[PDB]
């Protein structure tokens, strides 16, 4: 009663205290400062490949780290390893649940992680002495389905699920060793830092969270967005991440200086965003929409630098290479894509 | 041939044996009927189910040579807006009501019963984004014990603004008009409505026969005819 | 993982005969499948090849259309058919595994190989060493030549470094003169450019004592030349 309300007040002027502590840092934004420089010329990229095979809706890709093969994922029940230099088909993997929404690479090249409407999150062995694939191990201990996974290590990995929960697995054992809480609302994405000490995660209550790994706690929280955030990607630099919404807007979060950097909009998008990715140097954005094509931001003045305007359907799924050499985007028609 | 080497000559053969497997698994894909299961908790899903039965669940059943898969996602509660998606492309939505609740009051606010829940959700369902050409299947369960819960006390208590004899006929009727006027498409969409409790066999000609009819009118139109 | 193979003896000089490998262990249906040669007291050479899916057949231009390789999918178990059968043709016949796709190792696992002894342009391989004397501890090195470049233009440089202990079948060691096979201490590598080639051994044990084989996969035919002998 009383209690309650005491402590709500402490806590709004708490909120108070951190809105104040956050305005009083703030005395010029990027455009100000970058206003100086020249801009990067119309891009013109062009389809180099054309992946086909899959028969349905396509929801994720990942770039394996050699930058020649990746993997991909559909409502067909599939999951494909594709050649990308010659376009060949390398495997081919069954889905026990079809109803899947996320992929990923390892970073060695020996496993993949599957998972999605279901509540587990599946792994598979690519380098077995049998020819084939089979499934090495199956994560359960979520109460809602699976939005994101992403390898830490050959035997960690860190999931995403709808029950407003993320967790760290050991997948030697099969346990959770850390649970990350504090969303209130359905967690759709996360993106691991470039050194793995650290990741971001962002949800559909319309907030990011910064967590730490090792200790397991919440670090930092990041506020502004008015819808879900769909997708979240870190700089290369491994000190600012930006994100993309469903109310057609994509922002540019900092993390030393927890602000906000600068806005990625135009009055004719009113649809929303489904991915974003960044340049090897960061100096582009790419964003995927649902306007059917996909859109590059000249990363430091905010205006838009070219279109990858070639797609039919809905584009659910983007990635840039290691080297820098390729795009790749992939659709609700079922059709994959490269770009230089 | 020319440029390739000796080894590049068997990824291309692997790959195309590769094209050749996922090309025959989508022919049994598009051979099967996929349905949509919903309702309202304790609507009679259950038994709905056990008169067919053979995170998300999955059943499926053959009927005079004609495979069914049906998705059942109950167990979900998560926010709907996220994955009712996915289910763009089945052939149709089976929505459960149980009709002998037209006295029980829902838990959560008592003041409003559970009759009212169950239009709200096939008000919210019927008129969707992604189901604007889809077909639902309406089952009324248990009507064995609205029979006798309706002799003792009125419809009123739900109904006050019904003016009958509170007789079993025409309040089932009542009933029956009220939910089907709840559909706003009425060019691309049909609702077909059963009356069902504890009933055999007719439950499954009665999805049959609407199922055949879907497909019949999709056919239709998939040459311009219609 | 194992292959067993079957169907070797004493032949009569005009004849035929069959030759059996049964697979067992792993996914039979997507590997390619090799015959491979060895003459006693000589080097060893191939014979026929099969892919996966029985689409495309390689012979051995020794005894192109005078032999006749076969596969059963369904009961993992290879054929071969020597339809007519001579006074050279007395060698022992392995059978070997290999998978091609981005990355692969081809030439795994070798299998056992079954004697048959007979009643009485291409690529020139050559390792001109027969034989090397050397006591452990110390570096030891190997050295084969070409005919001309095997680097392609796509990148690879398609040669092979395998042993044969006495006594034994023989084992991948390089794959593609560069690469490791699994299972293989480090103490072994591959070098060289051009047409000209170099194995080498760092540190020198026990288990190294065997004979020495490099074999090209540019085309077809593939080529193995003679064997460098080491000694303890």
């Known amino acids: 009663g009383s209690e309650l309300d005491q402590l709500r007040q402490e806590a709004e002027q708490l909120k108070n205290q951190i809105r104040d502590a956050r305005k009083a840092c703030a005395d010029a934004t990027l455009s100000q400062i970058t206003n100086n420089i020249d801009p990067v010329g119309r891009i013109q990229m062009r389809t180099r490949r054309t992946l086909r095979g899959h028969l349905a809706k396509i929801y994720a890709m990942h770039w394996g780290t050699d930058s020649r093969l990746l993997v991909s994922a559909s409502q067909d029940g599939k999951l494909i390893i594709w050649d990308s230099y010659t376009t060949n088909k390398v495997h081919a993997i069954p889905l026990r649940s079809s109803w899947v929404m996320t992929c990923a690479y390892a970073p060695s090249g020996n496993y993949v992680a599957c998972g999605g409407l279901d509540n587990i999150c599946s792994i598979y062995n690519l380098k077995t002495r049998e020819g084939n694939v089979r499934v090495s191990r199956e994560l359960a201990g979520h109460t809602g389905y699976l939005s994101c996974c992403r390898f830490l290590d050959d035997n960690q990995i860190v999931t995403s699920s709808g029950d407003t929960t993320c967790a760290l697995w050991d997948i030697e054992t099969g346990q959770q060793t850390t649970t990350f809480t504090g969303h209130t609302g359905d967690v759709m994405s996360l993106s691991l830092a470039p050194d793995t000490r650290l990741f971001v995660s962002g949800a559909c209550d319309a907030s990011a969270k910064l967590w730490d790994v090792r200790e397991g706690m919440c670090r930092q929280t990041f506020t502004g967005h008015e819808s879900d955030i769909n997708a979240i990607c870190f700089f290369p630099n491994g000190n600012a991440f930006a994100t993309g919404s469903d109310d057609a807007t994509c922002r540019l979060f900092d993390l030393r200086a927890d602000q906000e950097l600068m806005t990625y909009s135009h009055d004719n998008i009113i649809c929303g965003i489904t991915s974003v990715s960044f340049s090897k140097s960061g100096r582009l954005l790419l964003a995927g929409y649902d306007d059917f094509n996909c859109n590059v931001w000249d990363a430091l003045k905010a205006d838009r630098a070219g279109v990858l305007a070639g797609h039919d359907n809905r584009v659910s799924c983007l990635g840039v290479t290691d080297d820098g050499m390729a795009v790749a985007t992939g659709s609700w028609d079922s059709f994959l894509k490269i770009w230089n | 041939g020319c440029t390739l080497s000796a080894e590049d000559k068997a990824a291309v053969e692997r790959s195309k044996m590769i094209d050749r497997n996922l090309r025959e698994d989508g022919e049994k894909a598009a051979r099967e009927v996929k349905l949509l299961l919903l309702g309202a908790g304790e609507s009679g899903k259950n038994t709905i189910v056990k008169q067919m039965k053979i995170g998300i669940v999955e059943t499926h059943f053959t009927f005079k040579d004609l495979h069914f898969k049906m998705f059942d996602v109950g167990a979900q509660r998560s926010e709907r807006k996220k994955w009712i998606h996915c289910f763009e492309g089945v052939t149709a939505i089976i929505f459960c009501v149980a009709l002998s609740d037209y006295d029980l009051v829902l838990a959560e606010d008592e003041e409003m019963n559970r009759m009212h829940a169950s239009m709200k959700l096939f008000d919210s369902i019927c008129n969707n984004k992604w189901f604007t050409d889809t077909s639902i299947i309406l089952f009324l369960n248990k009507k064995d014990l609205f029979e006798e819960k309706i002799k003792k006390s009125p419809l009123t208590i739900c109904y006050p603004e019904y003016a009958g004899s509170n007789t079993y006929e025409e309040a089932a009727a009542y009933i029956q008009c009220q939910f089907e006027d709840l559909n706003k498409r009425k060019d691309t969409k049909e609702i077909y409505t059963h009356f069902t409790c504890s009933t055999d066999t007719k439950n499954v000609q009665f999805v049959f026969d609407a199922v055949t009819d879907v497909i019949i009118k999709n056919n239709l139109k998939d040459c311009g005819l219609f | 993982v194992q292959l067993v193979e079957s169907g070797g003896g004493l032949v009569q000089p005009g004849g035929s005969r069959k030759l059996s490998c049964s697979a067992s262990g792993f996914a039979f249906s997507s590997f390619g499948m090799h015959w491979v040669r060895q003459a006693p007291e000589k080097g060893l050479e191939w014979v026929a090849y099969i892919s996966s899916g029985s689409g495309t057949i390689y012979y051995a231009d020794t005894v192109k259309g005078r032999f006749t390789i076969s596969r059963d999918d369904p009961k993992n178990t290879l054929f071969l058919q020597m339809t007519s059968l001579r006074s050279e043709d007395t060698a022992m016949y392995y059978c070997v595994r290999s998978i091609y796709y981005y990355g692969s190792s081809p030439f795994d696992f070798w299998g056992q190989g079954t004697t048959l002894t007979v009643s009485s342009s291409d690529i020139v391989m050559t390792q001109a060493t027969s034989s090397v004397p050397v006591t452990p501890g110390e570096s030891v090195s190997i050295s084969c030549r070409s005919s001309?470049?095997?680097?392609?233009?796509?990148?690879?440089?398609?040669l092979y470094w395998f042993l044969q202990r006495p006594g034994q079948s023989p084992q991948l060691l390089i794959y593609?003169?560069?690469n490791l096979a699994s299972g293989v201490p480090d103490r072994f590598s591959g070098s060289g450019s051009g047409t000209a080639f170099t194995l080498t051994i760092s540190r020198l044990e026990a288990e190294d004592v065997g004979v020495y084989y490099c074999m090209q996969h540019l085309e077809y035919p593939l080529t193995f030349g003679a064997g460098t002998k080491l000694e303890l």
């Open positions: 001309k470049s095997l680097l392609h233009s796509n990148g690879n440089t398609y």
């Open positions: 593609r003169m560069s």
